[PDB]
Structures are given as structure tokens and as C-alpha cells.
């Protein structure tokens, strides 16, 4: 049974800062990894999709809807980076994976402005 580890646990982000979020996919089960986001703009927990990286070759898929960038660091480590932090990408992130048609989720990472 696969478990995903997001890093870090939280991010209190400065305006304009670049944030890498990384998610290690353990076990050894599935294809790529899907990155998901919950805009702080929504009062009701509405997950929006962000990107999917294939496990096999470097081959991402971004939904149509500058800000993000993603790569597969060596092995099992899927990086999602927000290029410039702002109110737009301010919210909660997590990766997801699909083995034997079962969805798995990492913890959620609150990336929220400065304090």
C-alpha cells in the first residue's frame, strides 16, 4: 500500500518568493503523480487540478485554465514550484496517485502569505 510524503509541512510565503513543494511517492505502485490545489478564494473546499507528471518519461500535462513549473527530480520525487508567490496561488496543495483504480492523497500544505 503506497504512501505519499509532501514536503514541507507548511509554507508562510513572502510576496514574490519561489516555493518548491515536493512529494515523494513510495511503495512502487502506479504511473505518474497529480498535483492538486485548493484556492483560498473558495469558502467551500473545492479542489482544482494543476498538473500531472508521468512516472515513465518527462511528460507533464497542464490544464489550460506563468505561475507554476514542475519537474521530476531523480526518482519518486515530484517537484511542484510556484514561480512567484501571490494571492493567486495562495492556498492548500497536495499530490495524488492512482493504484489499482484507488486514489491516494498526501497531506495538505498550506502555502499562505507572510504573517
Amino acid at each position: 500500500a503506497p504512501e505519499l510524503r509532501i514536503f514541507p509541512k507548511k509554507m508562510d510565503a513572502e510576496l514574490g518568493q519561489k516555493v518548491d513543494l515536493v512529494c515523494e511517492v513510495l511503495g512502487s505502485v502506479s504511473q505518474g503523480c497529480s498535483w492538486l490545489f485548493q484556492n483560498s478564494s473558495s469558502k467551500l473546499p473545492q479542489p482544482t487540478f494543476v498538473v500531472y507528471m508521468a512516472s515513465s518519461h518527462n511528460k507533464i500535462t497542464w490544464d489550460e485554465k506563468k505561475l507554476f513549473s514542475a519537474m521530476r527530480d531523480t526518482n519518486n520525487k515530484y517537484v511542484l514550484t510556484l514561480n512567484k508567490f501571490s494571492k493567486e496561488n495562495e492556498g492548500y496543495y497536495f499530490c495524488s496517485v492512482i493504484s489499482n483504480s484507488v486514489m491516494y492523497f498526501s497531506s495538505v500544505v498550506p502555502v499562505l502569505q507572510k504573517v
Epitope: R5, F7, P8, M11, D12, E14, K18, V22, E24
Partner: antibody, heavy 117, light 108 residues
Framework: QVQLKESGPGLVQPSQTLSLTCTVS????????VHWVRQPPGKGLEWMGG???????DYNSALKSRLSISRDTSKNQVFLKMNSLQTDDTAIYFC???????????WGPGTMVTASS | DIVMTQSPSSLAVSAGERVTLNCKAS??????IAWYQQKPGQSPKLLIY???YRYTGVPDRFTGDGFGTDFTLAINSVQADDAAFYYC?????????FGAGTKLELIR
Amino acid sequence: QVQLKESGPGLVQPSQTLSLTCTVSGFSLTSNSVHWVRQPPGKGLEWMGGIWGDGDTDYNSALKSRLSISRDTSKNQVFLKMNSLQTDDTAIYFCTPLIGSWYFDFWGPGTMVTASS
Amino acid sequence: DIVMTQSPSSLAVSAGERVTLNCKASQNVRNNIAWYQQKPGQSPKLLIYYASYRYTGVPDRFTGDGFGTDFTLAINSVQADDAAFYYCQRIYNSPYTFGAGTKLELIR
């Protein structure tokens, strides 16, 4: 690519403050954390504390009151200040980061710091 | 607390034997454990992460077992190079406490 080197005066007069620098390469301080582990001669390893991507610091209760970790992100440097050194503080000090993971897979080589007059 | 207890204090074993080191956490921490190997005068070297995963480069014979409170580093046919200290660490939550280590001595 990933590398850390600990530097600082290798002899501290007792009651003075230890100051070490850890210069880093191969990753950003902005998204990862750097931690200090120390190891007295013949004794085991000891997590001391660390500093996170966003500047948050985290110490271990044993040393909370006399420990101070900061960083200069513009020069890839993380510092360690420790107060009123004694005999029991003589050790090797390692900096070792968490990059994208929650385990310590990369380590600096370590510096000896004797507390003696 | 979360106290980390490693037993035994030290072992004498022979080139080619299986060995088992134990690690006990006063609290439940699922699989949030790391194992390291250290030769005196050297930095620790990560062997095993999240209780059971072997780090890239680490040889076949190093294996890790356990979840909750009791954890096990095992070496299947030990070799002379394995004479070292072995430490477990709690991993995900602060403090990331170290066991007092186990010493692995060899018989020839």
C-alpha cells in the same frame, strides 16, 4: 551537487558563545531546512535544531534557552550560536539538511569545537 | 518525551551472519523512522528511511522492518565493512531524536 561545509573557531573559551557557519551548495535555503546535529567524543548523535524554508526555527528543549539558529539566504549560509559553553559541549558539529524529504540523506563533514581555557 | 531506545548496546557477530538491531519509541510514530551507519571520524550515512525503504546506493543486505513502536535494522550476511555504529532517528515530527546507537563488532 548537494554539499555543506561547517566552519568556525575550533576552540572556545568557557562561558563564551560558540559560532559556526554552514555554507551550502546544490539546493535552496528558501524551500528546504538546515539542521545542526552534534556528537561528543565517544557519545551518540544529537539533533539540536533547524531553520526552515520560511525562516521558522525549531530547537530541542534541552538546548532551547541557549541556542540560536539563523541564516543569510543571499550567501547560502546558515549559522549556529550557542551560549555559555562548558566541557559537556565539546563535540563535532554537523549541519545536515532536509531537502524535499524528512530524512537526513546528506551530511556536512563536521567540525570539532573544544570548550577549554 | 518520545524517548528512543536501542538494544542491544553492542554486538559481536561473524562475516556472513544475519544481524538484528532493535529500536523502541516510547510513543506510536507509525513508520516515521530513519537508520544511519557511522564509522568513527566520519559523517553518518543514511541506510534506511520511513522504517522500511532502502536509500539509493545502500547495499542489498540492509533491510528495515516495523511500524508503530518497535523497529528493526537487519543485515543479511554481514561483512567486515559493516563494523560501525548504527543509530535510529524519529523523523517526521520535532524533535528528531536519536537512539544512543548500537555498536557492531566483528569476529574473525
